[PDB]
């Protein structure tokens, strides 16, 4: 059971097996965050759900992505897989000074 929040103005919650969204709670959330290790999201939920849809998914691959693993990231980049490239380029175009 993973949850996600950002300044963007959204909030998500979903399950590791299948990224089929779970309605969100804000009270277990604050506890789990304030104590447990926090992982800097680099692939947002839009992207995770889509990557699920139009592209293959391995439970290995999934553990890795939710871990923001280097290997899955770079291999995804090299395979021309456009959605992750578009998310990364959005991140770039955010660094505008």
């Amino acid at each position: 059971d993973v949850f996600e929040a950002g300044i963007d103005g959204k909030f998500f919650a979903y399950k590791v097996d299948t990224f089929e969204e779970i309605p969100f709670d804000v009270q277990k959330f604050a506890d789990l965050v304030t104590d447990s290790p926090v992982i800097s999201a680099i692939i947002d939920f839009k992207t995770l759900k889509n990557l699920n849809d139009n592209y293959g998914i391995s439970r290995q691959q999934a553990f890795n992505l939710l871990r923001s693993d280097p290997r899955v990231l770079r291999e995804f980049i090299n395979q021309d897989n456009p959605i992750i490239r578009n998310r990364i380029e959005q991140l770039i175009m955010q660094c505008r000074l």
Binding site: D17, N52, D53, N54, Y55, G56, I57
Partner: protein, 397 residues
């Protein structure tokens, strides 16, 4: 293959051709058919599920038969039936799903789904109820190698492309002369723009052209040809051909003259028409050529005089435009259309359970890249999954 269609249409006739009351004669055929289908389906262990996230499922069959001697139908009959009826419905929906995400680079005419591949064995070929609908019919005729095809309302056949041909230009961009055209689904809208208003061309006339190569051969289709392009008639800012900046374009429309439409096949003219608009016919073709012209008017009026000089400073460019839409066609190669839920169901299934993806399809069954590189092997795979999708559209939504 067709055994699946037998299953599906039989279960449809089960759900519906049986209601409370009827006389034994009306469905006697179907009741005997179904009792034989039952004595068939039992006694063969099935495992269905286990690809992507579809769960492995054990299946066996054991159920009594149906009343064989009756006068008027009673509710007890339908009550005894509907349970196993729905059970069969569920299993065949599982068949559809398990089938409709498989891949095969070199095959796609024989089964590839475990319970399915078991079921096309000849030991069950006693359930072939009747093959009466477009897709199963085209399939069982493609097996016996005759002329075949589907009729399409709004066929999505032209790959979406927004590209523009340039015939006169300079990096200051004040004397553009070229053609733009947009393609999507069933329609193609073209325009040709001149900055010069044919003021320097020979004979006060200038030419515009367009070629559209299809990727499959159509036949006997309706073409709505309307001589006033709408999508290219307004001030636009479009980026350059290689990209360092953008450029501007402010057209104004005139009515075309001396237009020529031709539908050619294999390098041979099949249909050729001159300045005729409205609805026209296509019989055998795969290539569209449009050729039209713009003339500087022989005589003018005040505003027309202020807008068309010979001088350098141009500010109102002129244009001509055509719209060619294929509304209904008949074809051999299967094409996703806008009259059913087939491609939609395909994509929903693919998304639903996270299939391993390979080059047997473009990732996600997105239609553009598919029809771009339309391949007969991909076509075989696609026809198979499409017939099975249509089969699904007969039972459950």
């Amino acid at each position: 293959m067709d055994v699946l269609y037998s299953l599906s249409k039989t279960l449809k006739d089960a759900r519906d051709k049986i209601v409370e009351g009827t006389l034994y004669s009306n469905v006697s055929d179907l009741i005997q058919q179904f009792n034989q289908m039952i004595i068939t389906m039992n006694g063969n262990e099935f495992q269905t599920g286990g690809i992507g996230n579809l769960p492995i499922r054990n299946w066996n069959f054991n159920f009594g038969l149906l009343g064989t001697t009756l006068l008027n139908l009673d509710a007890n009959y339908v009550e005894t039936a509907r349970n196993t009826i729905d059970y069969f419905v569920d299993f065949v929906d599982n068949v559809c799903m398990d089938e409709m995400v498989r891949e095969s680079q070199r095959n796609g005419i024989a089964p590839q789904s475990d319970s399915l591949r078991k079921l096309s064995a000849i030991k069950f070929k006693r359930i072939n109820f009747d093959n009466s609908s477009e897709y199963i019919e085209n399939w069982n005729l493609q097996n016996r190698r005759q002329r075949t095809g589907f009729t399409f309302h709004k066929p999505n056949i032209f790959p979406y492309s927004a590209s523009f041909t340039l015939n006169r230009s300079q990096p200051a961009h004040d004397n553009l002369m070229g053609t733009m055209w947009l393609n999507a689904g069933s329609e193609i809208q073209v325009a040709g723009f001149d900055y010069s208003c044919a003021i320097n061309a020979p004979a006060n006339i200038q030419q515009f052209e367009h070629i559209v190569p299809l990727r499959r051969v159509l036949t006997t289709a309706t073409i709505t040809l309307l001589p006033d392009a709408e999508r290219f008639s307004f001030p636009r800012v479009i980026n350059s051909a290689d990209g360092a900046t953008t450029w501007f374009f402010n057209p104004v429309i005139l009515r075309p003259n001396n237009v020529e439409v031709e539908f050619l096949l294999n390098g041979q003219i099949i249909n050729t028409y001159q300045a005729r608009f409205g609805t026209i016919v296509a019989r055998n073709f795969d290539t569209i050529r449009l050729s039209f012209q713009l003339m500087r008017p022989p005589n003018m009026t005040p505003a027309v005089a202020v807008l068309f000089p010979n001088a350098q400073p141009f500010e109102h460019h002129a244009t001509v435009g055509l719209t060619l839409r294929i509304e209904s066609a008949v074809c051999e190669s299967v094409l996703a259309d806008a009259s059913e839920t087939l491609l939609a169901n395909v994509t929903s299934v693919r998304q639903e359970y996270a299939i391993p993806v390979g080059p047997v399809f473009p990732p996600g069954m997105n239609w553009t890249d598919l029809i771009t590189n339309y391949s007969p092997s991909r076509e075989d795979n696609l026809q198979r999954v499409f017939t099975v999708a249509s089969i699904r559209s007969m039972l459950i939504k």
